[PDB]
Write a protein that binds this ligand. Sequence first.
Ligand SMILES: Cc1ncc(C[n+]2csc(CCOP(=O)(O)OP(=O)(O)O)c2C)c(N)n1
Ligand SMILES: Cc1ncc(C[n+]2csc(CCOP(=O)(O)OP(=O)(O)O)c2C)c(N)n1
Ligand SMILES: Cc1ncc(C[n+]2csc(CCOP(=O)(O)OP(=O)(O)O)c2C)c(N)n1
Ligand SMILES: [Mg+2]
Ligand SMILES: [Mg+2]
Ligand SMILES: [Mg+2]
Ligand SMILES: [Mg+2]
Lengths: 526, 526, 526
Amino acid sequence: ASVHGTTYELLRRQGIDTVFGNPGSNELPFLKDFPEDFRYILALQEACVVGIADGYAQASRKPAFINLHSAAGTGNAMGALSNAWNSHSPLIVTAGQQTRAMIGVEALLTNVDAANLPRPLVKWSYEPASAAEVPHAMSRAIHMASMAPQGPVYLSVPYDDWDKDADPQSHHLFDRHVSSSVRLNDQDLDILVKALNSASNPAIVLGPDVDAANANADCVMLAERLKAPVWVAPSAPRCPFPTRHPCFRGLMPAGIAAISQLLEGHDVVLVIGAPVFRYHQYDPGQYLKPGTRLISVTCDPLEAARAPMGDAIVADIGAMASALANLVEESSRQLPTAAPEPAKVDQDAGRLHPETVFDTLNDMAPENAIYLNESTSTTAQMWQRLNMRNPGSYYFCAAGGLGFALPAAIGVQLAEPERQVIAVIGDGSANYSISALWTAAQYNIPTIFVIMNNGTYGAARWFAGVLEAENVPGLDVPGIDFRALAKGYGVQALKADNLEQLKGSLQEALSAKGPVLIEVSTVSPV
Amino acid sequence: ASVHGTTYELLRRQGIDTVFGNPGSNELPFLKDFPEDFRYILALQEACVVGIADGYAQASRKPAFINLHSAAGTGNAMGALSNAWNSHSPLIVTAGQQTRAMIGVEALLTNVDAANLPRPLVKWSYEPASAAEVPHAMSRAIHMASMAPQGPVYLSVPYDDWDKDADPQSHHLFDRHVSSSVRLNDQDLDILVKALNSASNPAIVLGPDVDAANANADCVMLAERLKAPVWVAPSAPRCPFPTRHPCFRGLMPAGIAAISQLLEGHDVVLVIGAPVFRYHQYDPGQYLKPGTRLISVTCDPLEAARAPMGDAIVADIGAMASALANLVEESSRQLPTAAPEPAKVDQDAGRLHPETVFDTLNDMAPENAIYLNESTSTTAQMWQRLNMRNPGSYYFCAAGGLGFALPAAIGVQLAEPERQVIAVIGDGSANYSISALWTAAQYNIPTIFVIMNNGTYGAARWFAGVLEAENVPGLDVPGIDFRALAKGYGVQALKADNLEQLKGSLQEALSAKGPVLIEVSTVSPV
Amino acid sequence: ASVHGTTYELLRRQGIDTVFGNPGSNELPFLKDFPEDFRYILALQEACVVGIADGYAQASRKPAFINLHSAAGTGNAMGALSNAWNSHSPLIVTAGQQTRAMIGVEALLTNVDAANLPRPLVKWSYEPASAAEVPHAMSRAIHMASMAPQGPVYLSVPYDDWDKDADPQSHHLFDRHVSSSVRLNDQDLDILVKALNSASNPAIVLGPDVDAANANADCVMLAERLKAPVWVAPSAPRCPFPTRHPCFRGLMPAGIAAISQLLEGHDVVLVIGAPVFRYHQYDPGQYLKPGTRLISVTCDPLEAARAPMGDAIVADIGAMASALANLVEESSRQLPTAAPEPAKVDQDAGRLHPETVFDTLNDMAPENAIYLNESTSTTAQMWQRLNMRNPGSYYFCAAGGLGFALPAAIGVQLAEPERQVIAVIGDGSANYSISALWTAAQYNIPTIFVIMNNGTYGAARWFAGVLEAENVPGLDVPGIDFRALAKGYGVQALKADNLEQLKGSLQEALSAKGPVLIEVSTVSPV
Ligand SMILES: Cc1ncc(C[n+]2csc(CCOP(=O)(O)OP(=O)(O)O)c2C)c(N)n1
Ligand SMILES: Cc1ncc(C[n+]2csc(CCOP(=O)(O)OP(=O)(O)O)c2C)c(N)n1
Ligand SMILES: Cc1ncc(C[n+]2csc(CCOP(=O)(O)OP(=O)(O)O)c2C)c(N)n1
Ligand SMILES: [Mg+2]
Ligand SMILES: [Mg+2]
Ligand SMILES: [Mg+2]
Ligand SMILES: [Mg+2]
């Protein structure tokens, strides 16, 4: 059998049926005679390919396969790979390399020193020594991407490899099953459980890997058994907990001092599926105040190693959350009182306050809606004002790289056709991966895009204030007509200049069978 | 002084007065108190930032300075860096890093292992070990960018460095002159001149570094005294020769066998400022046919090392072209006859043959027009049909990475305000860096954007033919309205459904004071 | 032809006839049917293999070819490659790789991610994508190592490649000549010559690349015409000037303040073939005091870029030194007066002072002797007391990597059969590459090893004083019998406990036909 046939069989046999790509010559011998049980999703630029692929992988909780064109295509997608690195997204990124006969001469579209290009943003990067090796290399890619801690991997493949004979023994690869579904040994897990049982004022902190493990329900049960408040870890890329549960206390601010204060008076702090911690703003102080003991559970040794404080257990979040949920005694302490409802804000008949948008979305959106956030100055309000009961209801660019939410919303909507994806994106952020809209139109993926137009990079202006930066150029982005942009890529476009128009547009957007973009005129913070 | 003040003084004294960027928190302490004698050019995405800076750097023949945001911003720009790598574009790429105190905990927007990210696409890549080192590091960046072979470099700077005290001894950095304007020693140069004087049927092949060195006029002299036909080396990123000069023989096809067949009968082939060679399609055969001696003059050791044939001289192209032009005797042989005018392609009253568009541009565009090419299926015709008399008149993505021409056209126009820049871009290629249109609108940069809309990735279909690949998905890009895209970014948009509308639209765009986009309906190759 | 046959032809055709190696399974298909016109030099460990080739390459001023065993062998030589990096030694390091069929499974002696292993200490690092590419890859390594700035390169080759069919078009590789023999253009060179002619108190500073270029003779004539004093740049790996020429002022100390104090009063300082500067100890102050113009001529862009001060010309040192010596006017200033002869130190009938050893060596050694220094606390006294009239008379570990001198002494002696090599090596430093003694013995290479036994790491204790480091362990090395070690490896062993025995031992060493080690009891600094 050929490398072509063997590789598609391995993919198929390992559960892959969708290829996200932007093609070029070095990929044609891979893509030719594309099998009828595979689906190809074209995006017009490689940051969109990877973003779409990334949303699809996070929502489906399974590896996503990507096909890019050499160094240029791989390069265009590296910002997107930084997000995928931080979210532990199992992406199998493959890139076509020149024919082996011309790699030496460095013909046009040779990916020189290819394995080094995506580093340090990939778990594994490789160009096979021979055509026969390609299926084995792909096998490695697949398992490396899928093993905890999940993440992007990179395989460069010379285009002449596909027509060559596969390694005869390649069939051993098809049904290889690898498991990293592990948990702390019995003796040490009992010690942890006793520690949690003996705590007088436990707090829980939950990171994105809880939602990637679909460990949300076990964390609810753990929280209810320990009668403990629950915060989402800072810079949250996913929502690991129902936002209106009695225990839920919201998003931790991304600051050292803010978090030690929040955790003060809690004797044990159990962190699950999060870095300790993903701070953003510099807010020096104590990592922890006296009296506080931190225990981290993470699937990534890199996170465990770099924690400035606390103990760590490196294990599968799914397996550990389940184990802990079912092992901890029910505490006779009083269950936390639900956080109060956010106060409605004053809203005139003109431009919309972000708080008004999220209240309207919350009232009109279905209870199984999935929200994507790239409205970077409105994030704290969005967390207060959206009720998200279900797992897989929230995504935010995990490495802070803009151009994620728009394409990612298209991948999430593809992965979850029965759940309405609502992407809330700033006018700044929308431009990074704008051409992703075209995939929504061509493949008729019914994502709703709500562009929050305040005419500026609002969050940049906020940081300018916190860093006392005066006379900073390039913080405003006037003169962008997002309805024309939507129209350019064949997406239905609505305006929402006020609350009356917003409600009308959401009603029309929610019923639509294709993608809809709503341009909301929001109040600038200037 | 502060590291901030010392660094801007270094830039200023090194002739840098313009920052191309897309800002973020990590860049604010660098961009704050932006000096009044500096200019800041915002682009909405980093591939556009770098593309505009690259076009600018190539047209000005001076380094361009770039400021990006962490791993995300740098990542977004890497496809653009691979083009800059192949074009020897002197790009100084700076990226903001997290405060040194939070680099270890890997807070959000820590560029982890930063220096490795842009590798292998930069000459030099560095993160200073202290704030006081930053001006020295920047000095190194500037000189590494600017020394032959020119190319992109990378500096990651923790944002807390900028406010720190500068070393008073950093003042030595300000007026450093580094020269790489070198040529072959007298003895060996005379030997080369005698070989060229003794040649009975010499050929000259010119690459992009001739144009980058502005050695075009010297190569014209060299060609006229040797009475030698001149080709442009394959996959040409620039035009190093007047295309209607009697000696000019056209763009070499990007294939091994094709080139050796072309150079057959020429006893000495002098290659200047090009790789040997930038083949593209695999067209195996002889590198050189018997009887052809090849001598390459290159400013890049890496090119000289990887030539599969010939002698090489590593030296500055300008110093060497000038030396050779002046040292060679005038041959008594007859001057080559000018290539015949290309035949007029039959055109009906409907969709436009590409050949018709280039004929119209040639008849209507000014004689000092600058063209950029990202209409990938029409390159050979463009080269046959555009008369480019002057230096700096043609640009094409040097590593074949699409998303170059649109932003680069804006950079070129910025650097050359008195030369009309016309970017001929395919409908597929337009989408990679579409948001660069915004920068042309905001800064009123009067580039003409000619979108050749054939409904498809035509050059991919051509390679599918040559690779005998059938049932390849993702080769069609229907349903894109470019006039609506232009409108969304504030650029004036015209259509051209036929020859008369093309003429009218070009007349209107040529006289326009702002940027204009023309969507041309072109005949599809399918 | 085979890859094997074609590769040996290329090597042969490019002037290589000697292979320095330590063999293993992965290299046997390369080493088999070893040509009759090639020589193989075995060393017992890879630091010694590379040390010997380095000495050979430096003495011969030609590339040396090395063959090491996969990752462990390559890894063993990486300390030695750091020296080779710093001395710009043209080393072609090949390492055998596992058969391509077993790379993926990572069989024992798979060099995983091979090209990254020797980085960042190599100019070029590569594993070919196919067997047929190996000759081309070898061509690249050969030229990359040989081109200015010369340096070590690395090629990893799967062992199954050698028996495979080579491409017939690889014959074009055989006689490729690449020149980097370049100098500054006429116009800018005239400006420099005019500046040198106009200097009232010029100084010259010379570094190792002068010796490497064999530009010593031209620098003597340059110094004599400019009537200028001449220093060797600090931490000198080589000797670029006769040490008793009237202009010679000695080895600059490796500190910032000490060098600006030395250069004070010189209006123009011409630095040729050196970094600016290779400091060592931290001696903060001014890089250059006001009133001095520093002009650096360097073959290395990396050196040009990182100089804290001065202008730079990146050119070939031989071409430049020759150019300048012929272009400068003869100054009417008086020739500098020779520095005084050093004072005879007090010496009793017991342990030898280093000064006595070098005085005795100067008296007794032949005038064409070659000295290698790895006696680290006595370098200053060595430069004062040895008259080195000739080029190629001194070598010292260029990156400060101990274990260079002993093996490099053997390579130099092999390269220079008619010049007596005398390696002066401390008792600590002798141990790093002690096994190299065997190679001297086995190939009957008559190096003299003078071992300076002071029973301690002297220069470490010195630095311990300048750093005020008390209670530091591991500074003493008692209980090593170097005659026993010499006997162990079959090298004739003498001793010198006093001046009488030293004079007798050296007389014997100089007259001996094979290698000789002399263990000298020297006064300890403790
Ligand atoms: C690729 C990339 N470029 C730049 C940034 C820095 N950045 C953070 S927030 C921000 C502003 C985005 O503005 P907008 O989308 O309009 O949201 P708003 O702040 O106005 O709410 C920018 C440019 C980033 N994080 N990633
Ligand atoms: C970043 C990147 N992605 C993909 C490619 C592959 N590619 C080469 S040509 C081409 C066709 C572009 O089509 P278009 O711009 O419409 O011009 P046309 O081929 O129709 O003449 C594509 C997709 C590339 N070169 N670079
Ligand atoms: C591979 C390596 N290990 C350690 C050192 C540090 N080092 C520099 S000098 C020195 C002392 C060597 O002592 P010796 O050779 O006996 O000479 P002495 O200082 O006594 O003259 C040491 C350990 C080094 N430069 N390289
Ligand atoms: Mg905004
Ligand atoms: Mg990288
Ligand atoms: Mg097209
Ligand atoms: Mg010692």
